C-alpha cells in the first residue's frame, strides 16, 4: 500500500547511508510498477514480476538511494564496483527487484578497509589511512572516505542522477499478500 511515499518520496538518502522500509499489514498491487513507463530499469531476480501478486510474505523491505546512472549496473548480485563494495552490496543468492528511474529533474564512499557484507551499511566519516594508521587531522597520507557526485542538469545521462529502490522479500502466517 504505502509505496506512494517510497517511490514518490520527496528526497532520498544517498548510497553510503541507504535504509529500508516495511510493507507489513498490507495487501500489495505491484502493477503501479508494471504500468510505469518512466522506470529506466526494472530487474527482478528469482521471482517473476507480473505474478508477484500471487505470493505471500511476512514483510517486504525497500532500500532507497541515488547513484550516478553509470553505476546502476552494479546494484545487482555478484558485481564488482566501488558502490557494490563500500556502499551497498547485494547477496549472491539475492531475490527481489531493482528499480531505477531518472532524477535529473548526494555522496558515496570510495575508501574503506575491506568490503561490505550483503545488506550491511557503513555510516562513519573517519579519515582513511591506506595501511591502518589512526590519521591525525589533515597531515600526510590522510583522506576522508566519503565523496560527492556533484550532479548537474547539463552533462552525460550516465553521469546524471538516478533514483534506485531495491525490494527484497521475507515462518508464520504471511502478513502481506496480493489481491
Amino acid at each position, epitope marked *: 500500500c504505502p509505496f506512494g511515499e517510497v517511490f514518490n518520496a520527496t528526497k532520498f538518502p544517498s548510497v553510503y547511508a541507504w535504509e529500508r522500509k516495511k510493507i507489513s499489514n498490507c495487501v500489495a498491487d505491484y502493477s503501479v510498477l508494471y504500468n510505469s513507463t518512466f522506470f529506466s530499469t526494472f530487474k527482478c*531476480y528469482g521471482v517473476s514480476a507480473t505474478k508477484l501478486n500471487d505470493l505471500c510474505f511476512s514483510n517486504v523491505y525497500a532500500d532507497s538511494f541515488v547513484v550516478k546512472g553509470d553505476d546502476v549496473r552494479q546494484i545487482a548480485p555478484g558485481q564488482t564496483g566501488v558502490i557494490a563494495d563500500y556502499n551497498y552490496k547485494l547477496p549472491d543468492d539475492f531475490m527481489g527487484c531493482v528499480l531505477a528511474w531518472n532524477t535529473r529533474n548526494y555522496k558515496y564512499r570510495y575508501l574503506r578497509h575491506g568490503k561490505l557484507r550483503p545488506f550491511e551499511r557503513d555510516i562513519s566519516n573517519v579519515p582513511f589511512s591506506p595501511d591502518g594508521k589512526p590519521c591525525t587531522p589533515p597531515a600526510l597520507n590522510c583522506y576522508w572516505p566519503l565523496n560527492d557526485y556533484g550532479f548537474y542538469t547539463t552533462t552525460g545521462i550516465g553521469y546524471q542522477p538516478y533514483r534506485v529502490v531495491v525490494l527484497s522479500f521475507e515462518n508464520a502466517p504471511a502478513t502481506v499478500c496480493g489481491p
Partner: antibody, heavy 119, light 114 residues
C-alpha cells in the same frame, strides 16, 4: 499481459549475415528478459541465451558463446539474434521467450521464426 | 552445470488414465530461503510454440486445467496428467531456471491408446 511477435521466415545461402528480430508489445514490458531457443526439425529445445533490454545485459550458453550474438534495443522493445555468417547446421526454428525476471520461467512465447540456409 | 534428464522417451496412455513423466537433475534446484524449486514444465503440441504449464514444480500457470499436476523436490520431479484427454497429445519438457545457463529436458512424447 504482453505479446511477442518475431520476424518472418528467412531463406538464406551458406555464408551470409542474418539478424532476426523479436518485438514485444503490451503493458509491463520493461520487466521482461528475452531468451532465445533453437529447435531443429524433429529435435527438442535448446536454450541459447538471454538478454535484458533495459541495459542489454546478456548471458550466453556455453554452446553458443561467440557463435551468435544476442542484441537488444529498448527504443522499439526489440530483441535480436544474429549470425555474421550462416552454417548449414543453423537451419531450424528460433523462438524468443520472455521471463518477468531472471531465474524465472518463460511466461510469453513468440510464434517462431523459420530459418533455412541451403545451397 | 545443471543438466536435466527426463524419462521415458515416449509413453502411450489410454484416455482417462494417468500419464506421469519423471525429470531428474544433476544438482538440486531449491533456493532454501523461499523454499521453492526452480523447475518448470512446458507442453508443445505439433506446429505450435511451447506453453508454460507449471512453475516452481507445483504451481500452475493461469488458465491451465486442474488435471495437470506437478510434484517432487530436491533432485526428482514428476509431471502427472490426470483424466488424459485427446488434445493432450504433445511433447512435454522440464526446464530448470535455477542457474544460468538454463537447461531443458530432452522431452517426452505422450501418445494415446484408444
Amino acid at each position: 499481459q504482453m505479446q511477442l511477435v518475431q520476424s518472418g521466415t528467412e531463406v538464406k545461402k551458406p555464408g551470409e549475415s542474418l539478424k532476426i528480430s523479436c518485438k514485444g508489445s503490451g503493458y509491463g514490458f520493461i520487466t521482461y528478459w528475452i531468451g532465445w531457443v533453437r529447435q531443429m526439425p524433429g529435435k527438442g529445445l535448446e536454450w541459447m541465451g538471454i538478454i535484458y533490454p533495459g541495459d542489454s545485459e546478456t548471458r550466453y550458453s556455453p554452446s553458443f558463446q561467440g557463435q551468435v550474438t544476442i542484441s537488444a534495443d529498448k527504443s522499439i522493445n526489440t530483441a535480436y539474434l544474429q549470425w555474421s555468417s550462416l552454417k548449414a547446421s543453423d537451419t531450424a526454428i528460433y523462438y524468443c521467450a520472455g521471463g518477468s525476471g531472471i531465474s524465472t520461467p518463460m511466461d510469453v512465447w513468440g510464434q517462431g521464426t523459420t530459418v533455412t540456409v541451403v545451397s | 552445470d545443471i543438466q536435466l534428464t527426463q524419462s521415458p522417451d515416449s509413453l502411450a496412455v489410454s484416455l482417462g488414465e494417468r500419464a506421469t513423466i519423471n525429470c531428474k537433475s544433476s544438482q538440486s534446484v531449491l533456493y532454501s530461503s523461499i523454499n521453492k524449486n526452480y523447475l518448470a514444465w512446458y507442453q508443445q503440441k505439433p506446429g505450435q510454440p511451447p506453453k508454460l504449464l507449471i512453475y516452481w514444480a507445483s504451481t500452475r500457470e493461469s488458465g491451465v486445467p486442474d488435471r495437470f499436476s506437478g510434484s517432487g523436490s530436491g533432485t526428482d520431479f514428476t509431471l502427472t496428467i490426470s483424466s488424459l484427454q485427446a488434445e493432450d497429445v504433445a511433447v512435454y519438457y522440464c526446464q530448470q531456471y535455477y542457474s544460468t545457463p538454463y537447461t531443458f529436458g530432452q522431452g517426452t512424447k505422450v501418445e494415446i491408446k484408444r
